């Protein structure tokens, strides 16, 4: 049975950084050579295992995650390193098996007025435990005063969107990114 991973890759809508889409694969077969070869996605560099050996590896289940980030953020998305988005929004637990896909679909991503549907989160009390999201609209107070849960000078609203446009410098236009993880369970591996 062919897997819908190609469907997930070829998807009109990706969710923003603060809430990333997640898909799972069951009782199915996925030809990875379609990702291995040339794709409309330019970059295939990733760390999990040796990519060629993937065929003979027995694996239980597959996790699919996609989002839209910036070009420089694509550099920092890699695990084992600290960034403002990675420490606060999306953290990769080190030693994970599976790997990353990167590219720039600027043609669809860019919008004449600015595609502001994409959002990020830059205000939090502490760091983020890997593989965990906090989609909270709660008003954030940092200084001494609690603000009474209302907009104020010291406290701030943590959520705010990007600024896009059809023509822009390279590395700053939005980049659509999908990542996957591989693991083993005691159950019969349905791959």
């Amino acid at each position: 049975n062919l897997c819908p991973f190609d469907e997930v890759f070829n998807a009109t809508r990706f969710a923003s950084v603060y809430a990333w889409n997640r898909k799972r694969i069951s009782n199915c077969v996925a030809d990875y050579s379609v990702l291995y070869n040339l794709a409309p996605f330019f970059t295939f560099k990733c760390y999990g295992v040796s990519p060629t050996k993937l065929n003979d590896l027995c694996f239980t289940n597959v996790y699919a995650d996609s989002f839209v980030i910036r070009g420089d953020e694509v550099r920092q998305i890699a695990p084992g390193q600290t960034g403002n988005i990675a420490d606060y929004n999306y953290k990769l637990p080190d030693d994970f098996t599976g790997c990353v896909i990167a590219w720039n679909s600027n043609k669809l991503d860019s919008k004449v007025s600015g595609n502001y549907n994409y959002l990020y989160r830059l205000f939090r009390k502490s760091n983020l435990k890997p593989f965990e999201r906090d989609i909270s609209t709660e008003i954030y107070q940092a200084g001494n005063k609690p603000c009474n849960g209302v907009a104020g000078f010291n406290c701030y609203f943590p959520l705010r969107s990007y600024s896009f446009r059809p023509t822009y410098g390279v590395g700053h236009q939005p980049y659509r990114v999908v990542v996957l993880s591989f693991e083993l369970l005691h159950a019969p591996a349905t791959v």
Partner: single-chain antibody
Framework: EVQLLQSAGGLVQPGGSLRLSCAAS????????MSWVRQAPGKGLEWVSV???????FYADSVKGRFTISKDNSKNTLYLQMNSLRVEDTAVYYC????????????WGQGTLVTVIVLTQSPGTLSLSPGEKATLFCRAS???????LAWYQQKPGQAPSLLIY???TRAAGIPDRFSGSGSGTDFTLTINRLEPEDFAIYYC??????????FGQGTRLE
């Protein structure tokens, strides 16, 4: 009425270590970002270090290492550890807080001097009698966003502050003289009327393009 106090100095001849106590009121170091910017004597001021809430910290690209910024929530005092230095390190050191979207380097202390995308300001240095409209233009290279622009006021003997944070909406204490509007890569800084405190040096500013923040050399307006 958030305020800031710190003190250091001396060291005409080399001293390996030096620690200045940035002590704050109205906010905590663990609350938000903390930043440092040093201004060389009669030269451009550049970014050196910012700590991120939760522990993470980045240092200046020009000189990796040899510094150590530590965040103390116990004292509410920020310290910046030195190992040892050489010449050209000397400059007035400012500790400041930033949020980079609705305010860029909003509140600064008073600072003191230790001792041992590019923005180019096309108009240059202008001297002019009071009562005439003036303009300033900031030139870039990577055609970045209007929302990432900031502009600053500096007066001799006064620690520099901000006037507009996003380049479109003026910050607290709006002047009906300055204005912010930009097209393409060049963002216009036009001035209506000249005041004695208005005759001063100004720096174009860019934030958020990278964790490191770049400044311009500055131009003299009077």
């Amino acid at each position: 009425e958030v305020q800031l106090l710190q003190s250091a100095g001396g060291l005409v001849q080399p001293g390996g270590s030096l620690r200045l106590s940035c002590a704050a009121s109205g906010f905590t170091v663990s609350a938000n970002y903390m930043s440092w910017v040093r201004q060389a004597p009669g030269k451009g001021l550049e970014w050196v270090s910012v700590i991120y809430p939760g522990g993470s910290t980045f240092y200046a690209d020009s000189v990796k290492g040899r510094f150590t910024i530590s965040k103390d929530n116990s004292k509410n005092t920020l310290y910046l550890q030195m190992n040892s230095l050489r010449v050209e390190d000397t400059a007035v050191y400012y500790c400041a807080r930033d949020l980079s979207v609705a305010g860029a380097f909003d509140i600064w202390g008073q600072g003191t001097l230790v001792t041992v995308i590019v923005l180019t300001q096309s108009p240059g240095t202008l001297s002019l009698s009071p009562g005439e409209k003036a303009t300033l233009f900031c030139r870039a290279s990577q055609t970045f966003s209007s929302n990432y622009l900031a502009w600053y006021q500096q007066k001799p003997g006064q620690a520099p502050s901000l006037l507009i944070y996003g380049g479109s909406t003026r910050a607290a204490g709006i002047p009906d003289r300055f204005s912010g509007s930009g097209s393409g890569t060049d963002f216009t800084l036009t001035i209506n009327r000249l005041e004695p405190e208005d005759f001063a040096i100004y720096y174009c500013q860019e934030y958020g393009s990278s964790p490191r923040v770049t400044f311009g050399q500055g131009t003299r307006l009077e």
